[PDB]
Structure formats: structure tokens, C-alpha cells
Write a protein that binds this ligand. Structure first.
Ligand SMILES: O=N[O-]
Ligand SMILES: O=N[O-]
Ligand SMILES: O=N[O-]
Ligand SMILES: [Cu+2]
Ligand SMILES: [Cu+2]
Ligand SMILES: [Cu+2]
Ligand SMILES: [Cu+2]
Ligand SMILES: [Cu+2]
Ligand SMILES: [Cu+2]
Lengths: 336, 336, 336
């Protein structure tokens, strides 16, 4: 409430980690409200999104696309120190959909290269929320250049299902889905540029068609496959947080389900259950809780299979454990 | 139920107002069921939809894009007098998604220029509902030319949250979102036509691309911005009714939330809460309730930011009142 | 659990029927769990999808687009004998979104032309689910070639509303919606190919536009109209199961509503009510229950009206019975 009361609150410095991993945290809040501090440096950098060497001039929070997931509990204060190095060429800011006021913080955080700012907001509503840059007049360009992420505001008492039973996860992963619009020369080959501003004009043109050239998880085709496939074990309870700051998505765990899905991403809105495919509108984050029952590889995809398999929206899960023949079994293997 | 009963009902004429404003009404029903009378005249006229002077041959109920919001209470009868002036060149009708029978009323209301008709229907289900023109054979064309609106059928006892607690708004706004498909010549310049019919062929080709050239609120880019921005004050409860008769939208109040959102637009379906971004499918209306907590300018947009900032789907809210530093504060303003 | 306990379970072979019809079944379970057997033969065949004679080298389960609806009860075992004829040229498999393990069964059912296989899985979650072919590396191509359908796992106690009140339908229809991507020549005319292979490259290009040339019900424009229109009567309770394995859809019954809609298709997730237009994300099936109140023709459509009336997503209902003037009446017929 009063400035004095907040000043008396305990503070905690949090160390952020690159997605799909999430920084250390407790599901059930340990203590009364606290002022949780985070710091992120913005990095304008070239990223290679496919095996054809296609480049995107990314604008990354903390150096990754998407930016890192920040975890706090309801009614804590999130205090972010955002830094825009002199090495950058553009003005940047940040809008937290979890925050109330000044365009989510964007109106208070406009920093040119060489500046920094510290914003504090009370995480009044529990749920997963998108955050992204939004420089007046250059909003979609920064967002589709990968300048977005999400935060999770856990209820103090952790997650619960619709009937109040607790839902405690064993593992948590953050999948940030991105729609990229890469210009092509007259031959159909993606163009490369020597600077962000150089690509601007060409990129806006592709954007207006509303047809992405690539739709990827964690910044590139295959990011979350192979050496980067997510893992779990049969019997493990996993929470998958998924965000899309500009375009709709329809997550689906091939071989599994969304046991409980907070499709709107808001914990006070009861989760849907036994989901095959859920929907997350552009501009929101959602969360799915599932207990693995079968070992093997799974594919986590945006279920418009063209986007998943032609455009790049596909990730994998490698699960260990014993096969359950009651759930599924090959009565007759493929034969003549 | 019986003949005598329906005939005995009080009749009440209501004067409509142009969106985003809504005609005078009471949230909780005043008295018993009545036959609520409305009259709308159809206007076919050229309108400028952007800052470049792009013209469109609009087809509008009451002359506005979207058509006005009609408000009744559950179990009232809505009796509409629809007039199609002889000066018009096309046949028109109306489909009330709130109505039951004859294609929503479209089958009983086909009027050529020079004709009028009166349709009555019992508003049996509570919620916000889309209404639109639907001449057989050219349904899409009339709808994407601006011929659609919405009605609100309030529960006789007003709005309530998930657990029976009353939700009373101080104001209500109706934002109608329109996807336009304007043809361009070989040079990329939008084309102008003499009569509506002349644009038909070229328009359908653009429509089939499923990519609108414009996505606007209240009929034009910036229609709900600047001096035409909607208003509120800290502590004020606002209901925003939003509709899209042909294409999906994902509404978001930048700097705010949808405290209670009947995303499906139906009041018997519990509203979602603490929403960051909600989803309204094409062919439906939705409603969001919010109590403002911070003063300043807000942007209400379709969260596909390319559609919001490149195509036109962005409106403003100007809110007066005191800033709340507990909710948000700039600890360190942008500095070196 | 053990193969012995499942083998001791009663077995029942079912004869599938072509959509939109559904094979015989009981809403409330007939005794205890059983192994329900189904068989489907895959056929690669050319089909005509519109009145201009446009053809598609379809890949169809049971020779139909969509494949037929399999109906079982929660905790029953679905045992499918899938056959891929010598006459076929491609390998096919099946992924049941209702199943748990091996990519929905897809990794255990890869059969080359001249092969067959038998997969059994426990239908552990109640709801309607999509099933589709998914040959690694050629997933979207098989799906958008028509190789998908849906199954319904009814609660053992039949359907119930969100409050436990029983919901028994008189009729049921299965509407499979298909997005087709047909290449066109320099004259804008759809192309025809000798072998499905010759079409691959051109089709992939169209697929990458994320813009289908046709969006149809039961494999063709107008397939569920005329003498093929669905039927009902005033007072009749009808359940419509709708699926879209690759792309979003927003169903709407013109002139009616979705009284209870399991928009996510999962029966343990309470249905929305009084729906005007609902939403089914690509990769999912949904179900809507409605009691007809008015006689006449109804159009059941995907509510992006361009997809419905330009692309092919519109079906009809012919309803017999008496007109209800209380619900709707033409006070004044179109006149001067
Ligand atoms: O289950 N994925 O197509
Ligand atoms: O929440 N506005 O991009
Ligand atoms: O109500 N469907 O156009
Ligand atoms: Cu930025
Ligand atoms: Cu935003
Ligand atoms: Cu009209
Ligand atoms: Cu409609
Ligand atoms: Cu196949
Ligand atoms: Cu699938």
C-alpha cells in the first residue's frame, strides 16, 4: 500500500536462465510478499532460424528469443532493471501484460542505447502473462523480431485444479513461439542485411501479408529437438508454459494430452481437462499440466501441421520409463 | 406463452445512438417483459476508411459501421422495423444470432430498395450477439462491406460473476471490428468504383486470399483514437462489448485486463477472469468488464499487433484520476 | 491391466458407417468395459471436390473424407485393424488423439502398401478426438489430403450437462471439415495430376501460403446439402460432432444455437451454453447439443463467411414441424 510498507518488504535477487528452463523458485510462496528483482540486458543480434542459413535481426531480452520466464507469487512486486547497451541502435521498452498502468510499463521504460531504467509493479493477478517491447510506432516490428517473453505469477498456495486439489509439478518448461517474416529476393531466397534498420522496410511488407515465413519455438527451427529436446520420465508431472505475443497457436502433445490446461493462462479461471489440442490467442500465454504415462519420444507442436512441420513449430520430449501395455499395445505389428 | 399474454405486453420504442455509445437502458430489468421496438434504415454509401483517403462502398444499418447496439432483457421481444430506401441498389435483410428460426430472421426480412419489413423475435438467451445482413448468394460481401452489428440481451437480473455476485458497470461501449478487402491495381493503389456492384468481382478475389487490407474499429483507422478516444476514470467499471461478424479477433486492453470476460458472449456461461488477452471467433460478440485502477492513455487493440498497428485495429481510452504507486512505479526513470 | 484381464473382456465387432452418419451405439454403457473392434482399409483415390470438377488425389480411411466416427465408452479398449492395400503407393499409419503412447499409435502402425496392423489402446479420457495419418516427414501432406477423422469416447453414463443433469440426444451427425490446397495454372484454373506424386511439390507451395483453396464438409463443396442435407424435427435433440485435424474452425447453426457446446470436445470440461458461434482449434474435435424449436432450412457453417460461402464450408439441415410464432414472427412482410 504505502511506500513505507513496500520499503519494509524483504527483497530477493533472482538469477534468470535461458528458455526452455525456468529460474529456481518455490511453487508455494516461502514467506510474505517480497520485492523480487530481475535484470535483463537487451541485445540486438543476428540469429539463424533454419538450416538454410536464414537470418533474423533479433531484439532479444537477456539475449534470447523468447526472453526468460520470470517467476513471482501473487502480490509480490516484480522489479526489473532493464538495460539498453550503447551497442544497440534502437530505443526499447517493456510492456508486462501482468502489470496495471502506463501501457503495462512501456510508457515508463523507454530507454535509448546507453540508458537503463528500473520498473516496479505489483503482480496482483495469478497466471502466466506475456511481456514484450512496444516502442510507439514500431510495436509489431519489435515483437516479431523476437522481443517478447512471459512471466508466471503463481498463487501463494501454488497451483490447484478446479476442485481445489493441489497440482504440484516436478518439471517446468517455457516454450516461446515466434512468428517471423523474412523478406525474399526476386528468386525466393531469404535476404540478409547488414543492420536492423536495413531490413525494416522489406520486413514490414511481409508482415502486412499476415503470413509468416517461419513459426518457431525458442528462436529457430529445431531449437527444441535433439540435444535440446525436453525430457521427463513416466510418472513425472510436467508443466509446459507456452507464449505467443502476436499470433494464435494451438498446442498439442503428440502421444499425450493436456491433463489440465489453463488455456487463458489465468489461474483463477478453472483449467480445462483431458485436452487433446488447446488454443492460445496471439498476445497471451497459456499453461498445461500433464503426467507422463508412456516412455518414448513425443512431439509438442502447434497443431496446424503446416506451421508445425513446414514452418518450424515443433519440439520434442524424450521420456524414460516402462511401457504400459494396458494403455496401448501392438496386437499385430505391421505385417503382411 | 399464449396469444392473449403476448398481445398484452407493453410496447416500448427505443431511440438508437451511433457506436461506440449505447442507448439508455437499465441493467436490471424494469418491470416485466415488453416488446422493445427499434427502427433502422439501411444506407449504401461511400466511406473513407484510412488516412490515405481509401474509399469503400459501405452497406450499413442505421448508416454506421458497425450497426448500433440494441439492448433488451431476456424474454423481452425485439421488434425491428427495417427500411431499405428506394435510393439503394441492393436487396438486404437481417440475421439476428440472438433469434431462433428462419436463418435468424434473414428468411423473413428480404427487402428490395423501396421496401420495409417488421420482424419480431423473443430474446430467449442472455448474452451479446452479432446481427448481420445475409442476402442468399452474397452473404460474405454484405457482411464485409460493413453490414453487421450486435445486440445485448441482459439477464433480467443484470450481470453476475461466477458465484452470483452482481457486476454493475458505470459505462458501456460497443466496439465493432471490421475486416475490409479493398482491391488494388497493378501499381498497388487501392481502386475506386462507381457503384457497389462494380467492385464485386475484384473484392471477392481479395476476400478469397483471407487477408484483409484493413482491420478497423468503428469503421475506420483511428476511429476510436485522439479526440474520439473512449473515456473512464480510476475506480470506474466499464463494460466493453466487442464483435466480429466474419473473422476472429483477440481483444486486449494495454495497461489493463479483462477482470471478467464472457469471451463467448453468453451470460449463462461463467466468465473467465483476470484476462490479459481474450479471443472472440468470427461470427460472435464477446464482453469484458474492467474496473480502471490507473489514469492515463490506454490502447485497446486486436492483439495480432500487425493487425492492430499496421492494419488499423487499435483504439484509445483516456482515463482521469490518481496514479497508484503501489500498483506500478518507476524506481529509476530512463537514464544513462 | 494385465493382458489376461483384457483378453477376458467381452469383445464386440462394429460395422462403421460413412459420415455424416454414425454407427449404432448406446449412450449409456452396455455393461462393463469391452474390447471394441473396428477395421479400416486405406484407399488412395481421386475425388471431385466441387461442381467445376476439381479433383484431389485423396488419402482416405475407409475410403471417405473424413474417415468414419468410431464410438466407444470410457475405459473400453479400441482395437483397430488398419489395412494398407497392395494397390496403394504410400506408407500410412494412424495417430489417435484419444490414445496414450507412441505418438498416438502412429509409431506402432506404420504399414507399407500390402501390410496391415492391429493397434489396441485404452480410451481413458471421455470426449470427441481427432485421428489422422502421420507418416514421419510427410505429416501435413497426408492430413490435408483427407487422411483424418474423429472418434467419440462417451462417458460410461452417457452425456450430462455441467451440473450433472443427463443429456440424451435423439440423433447424431459427424461433420468432418477439410482444408484443401489445390494448385492452379497461369489461367487460375485448378490443376489435375496423373499420379498423386506429380502434385506434391505444387501442393506444398500452396500449403505454405496457409490459405486453403477449399474448406469443405464431408469432402466436397455442397456435400451436405440438397438431398444430402442433414435432417431433424421440431423438438428433436441433435448432437453434432465437428472435427478439423489441421486448421481452426468456428461452427455456427444459422437460425439456431449450440445449447450445450463442448467446444474443446472433452466431456470432463463443462460445456459452454447458449452459443451463437463456437471455436474448434485445428487438431481437435468439438461437439454441440441442440434441441430444434423451429421448422425450415438451416445452414450449418464455419462462420468465417468467406470460408463458408466462397470456400465451401456450409451444410444444410431440413427440419420438419410447426412454426413457433412466439419465438419469431414476421409482423410486416417485405412491402412498400
Ligand atoms: O498429434 N499431432 O499431429
Ligand atoms: O499489450 N499491448 O501490446
Ligand atoms: O448466421 N450465419 O451467417
Ligand atoms: Cu524493442
Ligand atoms: Cu501486448
Ligand atoms: Cu445487406
Ligand atoms: Cu451469422
Ligand atoms: Cu497416410
Ligand atoms: Cu495430431
Amino acid at each position: 500500500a504505502t511506500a513505507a510498507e513496500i520499503a519494509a518488504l524483504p527483497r530477493q535477487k533472482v538469477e534468470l536462465v535461458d528458455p526452455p528452463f525456468v529460474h529456481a523458485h518455490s511453487q508455494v510462496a516461502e514467506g510474505g510478499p517480497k520485492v523480487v528483482e530481475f535484470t535483463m540486458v537487451i541485445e540486438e543480434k543476428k540469429i539463424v532460424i533454419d538450416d538454410a542459413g536464414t537470418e533474423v535481426h533479433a531484439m532479444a531480452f537477456n539475449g534470447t528469443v523468447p526472453g526468460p520466464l520470470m517467476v513471482v507469487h501473487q502480490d509480490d512486486y516484480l522489479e526489473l532493471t532493464l538495460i539498453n547497451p550503447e551497442t544497440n541502435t534502437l530505443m526499447h521498452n517493456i510492456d508486462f501484460h501482468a502489470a496495471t498502468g502506463a501501457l503495462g510499463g512501456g510508457g515508463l521504460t523507454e530507454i535509448n542505447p546507453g540508458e537503463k531504467t528500473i520498473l516496479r509493479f505489483k503482480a496482483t493477478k495469478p497466471g502466466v502473462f506475456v511481456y514484450h517491447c512496444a516502442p510507439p510506432g514500431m510495436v509489431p516490428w519489435h515483437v516479431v523480431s523476437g522481443m517478447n517473453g512471459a512471466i508466471m505469477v503463481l498463487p501463494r498456495e501454488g497451483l490447484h485444479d478446479g476442485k481445489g486439489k493441489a497440482l504440484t509439478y516436478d518439471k517446468i518448461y517455457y516454450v516461446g513461439e515466434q512468428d517471423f517474416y523474412v523478406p525474399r529476393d526476386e528468386n525466393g531466397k531469404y535476404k540478409k542485411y547488414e543492420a536492423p534498420g536495413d531490413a525494416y522496410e522489406d520486413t514490414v511488407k511481409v508482415m502486412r501479408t499476415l503470413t509468416p515465413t517461419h513459426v518457431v519455438f525458442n528462436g529457430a527451427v529445431g531449437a527444441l529437438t535433439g540435444d535440446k529436446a525436453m525430457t521427463a520420465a513416466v510418472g513425472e508431472k510436467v508443466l509446459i508454459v507456452h507464449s505467443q505475443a502476436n499470433r494464435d497457436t494451438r498446442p498439442h502433445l503428440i502421444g499425450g494430452h493436456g491433463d489440465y490446461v489453463w488455456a487463458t493462462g489465468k489461474f483463477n479461471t478453472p483449467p480445462d481437462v483431458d485436452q487433446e489440442t488447446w488454443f492460445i490467442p496471439g498476445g497471451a500465454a497459456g499453461a498445461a499440466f500433464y503426467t507422463f504415462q508412456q516412455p518414448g519420444i513425443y512431439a509438442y507442436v502447434n497443431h496446424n501441421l503446416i506451421e508445425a512441420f513446414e514452418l518450424g513449430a515443433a519440439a520434442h520430449f524424450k521420456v524414460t520409463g516402462e511401457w504400459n501395455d494396458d494403455l496401448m499395445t501392438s496386437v499385430l505389428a505391421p505385417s503382411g
